């Protein structure tokens, strides 16, 4: 059962070398081709390159020869390096398992067939922000459930995740045991250049006395995690 | 390579055109990217479906390669990207520009608005932020205004563009950053969100 997870710095300075890793489980790295693809905000998909254990690698010319891909069999991961980065390199970066096929249009003896590639399993992607600003960890504050926050026996409580940089921030509740009624809002990019987001959970009011609620906030770029207890009043 | 947009009513057939320019035999792949998600392979080699793709999605046989979606539903709204391969070139590195599929005639839904006052922890820290959370609305266009007592608040307002939820409705957020003295001075603060000509106002007060 192939599963991919991209991991990166989340922030890089202009002209630095960007280093990314795709960790794969439920599959051997040597059994497949692998691709990296990226997407700029509100822009399309750009295929970066592909690699195979045979040592076969090939790169998109639009990356300007700045890209290197490699395979680490001991760790079962695919790695990407991108040199001399610019703001134009800010994007979400995906890794994808890549399959190849042959389409025959003629005499096989005349070698009248061609190969095509298709990316059948993608990771969720890792965001990369190219900026000269520093990382900033969030401050997290409780959004207390209150009669103001309550309608008709269901109560809203949450966590405010304020002023962080760069993306992403991850939020779970009660270490992932609490999933139903959880809504985590996309962050806002403030005029300051810092991000803020909120995560709320809708909960039975009856539970408020007897159930404890904790938001788990993870901001990997600053290597900080906060668990915040959210209580009524 | 592909049109940026297509709009369609629920239940009818969407036909999406590739970036095109193929010469000879072709192998076309289609990818589906829904809001806030990673791309998903929907078609390969013109007509082949990976396991799990509905029969509603079909490709065209082997220029002007087409992805057809019959009985379109709201859940089908996405960017659809094609990736065209042909005999001519050893490799095509470029994905199609992509097509934005919009589904029309979805039922309207008024926003639910929840407004949070600053936490006592934030106040203790000499900061104050009001949080206006807006969800479950359709269509996805909203205007957010803030008031201190009855006066419009211009400064310190930060508001997101709406984003689609997995239930096919939309959500957005608005933040008002205040000094604790600004917060304690006024009798109340209000978040007013206007949707389809109608307005829901939520109010909070220092107490």
Instruction: Report the run of H or E that residue B183 belongs to, with start and end.
Output: helix B180-185
Tokens of A68: 């290197």
Domain end marker among B105, B136, B159: B105
Q: Which of A160, A164, A171, A190 to mutate to test the interface with B (most CBs of B within 10 A)?
A: A160
Same domain? For B77 and B137 the reply is no
- CB distance A58–B125 less than 8 Å? no
Cβ distance of B129 and A160 shorter than 8 Å: yes
Quick check: A100 and A119 in contact, CB under 8 A?
no
In 3D space, the residue among B82, B96, B98, B99 whose CA is nearest the CA of residue B8 turns out to be B99
Both structure tokens of B139: 């269509």
**In this complex, do A160 and B95 lie within 8 Å of one another by their Cβ atoms?**
no
- Residue A173 C-beta-side C-alpha neighbours within 13 Å: 21
Q: Given the DSSP bridges, would you call strands A45-51 and A57-59 parallel, antiparallel or unpaired?
A: antiparallel
Domain co-membership, B125 together with B183? yes
Nearest one of A186, A157, A173 to A218, comparing CA atoms: A173
Residues 6+ apart with CB under 8 A from B25: A103, A105, A114, B62, B86, B87
- Take residue A183 and report the two structure tokens written for it: 């809504």
Residue A188 has its nearest CB partner, among B81, B86, B158, at B158
Q: B152 with B146: CB under 8 angstroms? A: yes
Asked if B76 contacts B35 with a C-beta cutoff of 8 angstroms, the reply is no
- The three-class DSSP label of residue B57 is strand
Domain boundaries, chain A: 1-132, 133-232
Q: Does A133-232 match A1-132 at the fold level?
A: yes
How many angstroms separate the CA atoms of B3 and B16, rounded? 8
A188–B173 C-beta distance less than 8 A: yes
Do B1 and B99 sit in the same domain of this protein?
Answer: yes
CB atoms closer than 10 angstroms to residue B63: 12
* B96 neighbors A129 (Cβ within 8 angstroms): no
User: Residues followed by a break in chain B, C–N over 2.5 Å?
Assistant: 62
Paired tokens of A194: 């810092």
Best of A184, A187, A198, A203 to mutate (most B CBs within 10 Å, chain B) = A198
User: Pick from A62, A125, A190: which is nearest to B38 by CB?
Assistant: A125
CB contact under 8 A, B119 and A160: yes
User: Does residue B78 sit in the same domain as residue B130?
Assistant: no
The DSSP letter of residue B71 is S
Q: Determine the CATH number of domain A1-132.
A: 2.60.40.10
Residue B47 CA to residue B26 CA, distance in Å, equals 11
A45–B40: do the CB atoms touch at under 8 Å?
A: no
Asked if B8 and B99 sit in the same domain, the reply is yes
Contact criterion met (CB < 8 Å) for A148 and B115: yes
Cα–Cα distance measured from residue B48 to residue B60, given in angstroms and rounded to the nearest whole number: 10
Task: Measure the CA–CA gap between B165 and B103, rounded to whole angstroms.
Answer: 15
Pairing of strands A126-130, A11-12: parallel
Q: What are the DSSP E strand ranges found in B75-185?
A: 79-86, 99-103, 112-116, 128-137, 143-148, 151-152, 157-159, 163-164, 170-178
Distance from CA of A190 to the nearest CA of B (A): 6
Domain, as residue range, for B204:
106-207
Domain endpoint, select from B75, B105, B135: B105
Contact A118 B129 (CB under 8 A): no
Select A133-232's CATH number: 3.30.70.100, 3.90.950.10, 2.60.40.10, 3.30.200.20.
2.60.40.10
Among B2, B38, B48, most A C-beta atoms within 10 A, so best to mutate, is: B38
N- to C-terminal Cα separation, chain A: 46
**Torsion sign (Cα): B134, B121, A150, A227:** positive
Tokens representing A77 are 């991961």
Partners of A61 on chain B (C-beta within 8 Å) are 93
Residues 6+ apart with CB under 8 A from A108: none
Q: Closest approach of chain A CAs to the CA of B90, in angstroms?
A: 7
Per-residue b or e along A17-38, where b marks 16 or more CB atoms closer than 10 Å to that residue's CB: ebebbbbbeeeebeebbbbbbb
Q: Extract the tokens encoding A74.
A: 């001991």
Q: Are B139 and B88 in contact (CB under 8 A)?
A: no
Looking at the structure, tell me whether residues B117 and B65 fall in a common domain: no
Rounded to whole angstroms, how far apart are CA atoms B22 and B73? 30
Between chain A and chain B, the number of residue pairs with CB atoms below 8 A apart is 126
Based on the fold, state whether residues B140 and B184 are members of the same structural domain: yes
* Nearest alpha carbon to residue A192 among A225, A214, A163: A163
The DSSP-derived string for chain A is: --EEEEE--SEE-TTSPEEEEEEEESS-GGGSEEEEEEE-TT--EEEEEEE-TTS-EEE-GGGTT-EEEEEETTTTEEEEEE-S--GGG-EEEEEEEEEEEEEE-S-GGGT-EEEEEEEEEE---EEEEE-SSPPBPPEEEEE---GGGEETTEEEEEEEEEEEBSS--EEEEGGGTB-TTEEEPPPEE-TTS-EEEEEEEEEETTHHHH--EEEEEEEGGGTEEEEEEE---
Query: Do B79 and B117 sit in the same domain of this protein?
Result: no
Residues of A in contact with B94 (CB under 8 A): 47
Of B119, B159, B160, nearest to A142 by CB-CB distance is B119
Could you tell me the sign of the dihedral formed by the alpha carbons of A29, A34, A38, A43, in that order?
negative
- Is residue A230 within 8 Å of residue A141, measured between CB atoms? no
Terminal C-alpha separation, chain B:
58
What is the number of residues in chain B?
207
Largest CA distance in chain B: 74
Resolution of this model in Å is: 2.1
The rounded distance, in Å, linking the Cα atoms of A195 and A63 is: 29
Vertex B9: Cα angle to B5 and B13 (nearest 5): 80
Contact list, B42 vs chain A (CB under 8 Å)? none
B183 is written with which tokens?
């917060």
Total Cβ atoms within 10 A of residue A175: 9
What are the strands of the beta sheet with B14-17, ordered from one edge? Answer: B14-17, B66-69, B57-59
Q: Residue A1: how many CB atoms within 10 A of its CB?
A: 6
Say how far apart CA B64 and CA A18 lie, in whole Å. 38
Shared domain for B6 and B85, answered yes or no, is: yes
From B72, B105, B138, the end of a domain falls on: B105
Residues B157 and B120 both lie in one domain: yes
Give the domain CATH number at B191. Answer: 2.60.40.10
| Tally of domains in chain B | 2
Nearest-CA neighbor of B109 among B88, B127, B136? B136
């Amino acid at each position: 059962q192939v599963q991919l997870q991209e991991s990166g710095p989340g922030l890089v300075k202009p002209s630095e070398t960007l280093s990314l890793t795709c960790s794969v489980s439920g599959a051997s790295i040597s059994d497949h081709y692998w691709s990296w693809i990226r997407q700029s905000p509100g822009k399309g998909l750009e295929w970066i390159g592909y690699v195979y254990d045979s040592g076969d690698t090939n790169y998109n010319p639009s990356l300007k020869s700045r890209v290197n891909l490699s395979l680490d069999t001991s760790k079962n991961q695919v790695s990407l390096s991108l040199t001399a980065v610019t703001a134009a390199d800010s994007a979400i970066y995906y890794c994808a398992r890549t399959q190849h096929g042959r389409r025959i249009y003629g005499i096989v003896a005349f070698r009248e067939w061609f190969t095509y590639f298709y990316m059948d399993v993608w990771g969720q992607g890792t965001p990369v922000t190219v900026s000269s600003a520093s990382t900033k960890g969030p401050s997290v504050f409780p959004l207390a459930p209150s009669s103001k926050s309550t309608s008709g026996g269901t109560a809203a409580l949450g966590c405010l995740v304020k002023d962080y940089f760069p993306e992403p921030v991850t939020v779970s509740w009660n270490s992932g045991a609490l999933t139903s009624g959880v809504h985590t809002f996309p962050a806002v990019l403030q005029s300051s250049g810092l991000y803020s987001l909120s995560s709320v959970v809708t909960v039975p009011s009856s539970s408020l006395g007897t159930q404890t609620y904790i938001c788990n906030v993870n901001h990997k770029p600053s290597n900080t995690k906060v668990d915040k207890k959210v209580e009524p009043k | 390579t592909q049109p940026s947009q297509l709009s369609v009513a629920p239940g009818e057939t969407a036909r999406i055109s590739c970036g095109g320019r193929s010469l000879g035999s072709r192998a076309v792949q289609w990818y589906q990217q829904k809001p806030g998600q990673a791309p998903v392979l929907v078609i390969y080699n013109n007509q082949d479906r990976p396991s799990g793709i509905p029969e509603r999605f079909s490709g065209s046989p082997d220029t002007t390669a087409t992805l057809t979606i019959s009985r379109v539903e709201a859940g089908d709204e996405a960017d659809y990207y094609c990736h065209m391969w042909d005999s001519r070139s050893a490799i095509n590195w470029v994905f199609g520009g992509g097509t934005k599929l919009t589904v029309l005639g979805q039922p309207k839904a008024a926003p639910s608005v929840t407004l949070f006052p600053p936490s006592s922890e934030e106040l203790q820290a000499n900061k104050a932020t009001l949080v206006c959370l807006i969800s479950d609305f359709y269509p996805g266009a909203v205007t957010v205004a803030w008031k201190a007592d009855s006066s419009p608040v211009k400064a310190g307002v930060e508001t997101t563009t709406p984003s689609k939820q997995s239930n096919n409705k939309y959500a957005a957020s608005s933040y008002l950053s205040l000094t604790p003295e600004q917060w304690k001075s006024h009798k109340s603060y209000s978040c007013q969100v206007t949707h389809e000509g109608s307005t829901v106002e939520k109010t909070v007060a220092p107490t």
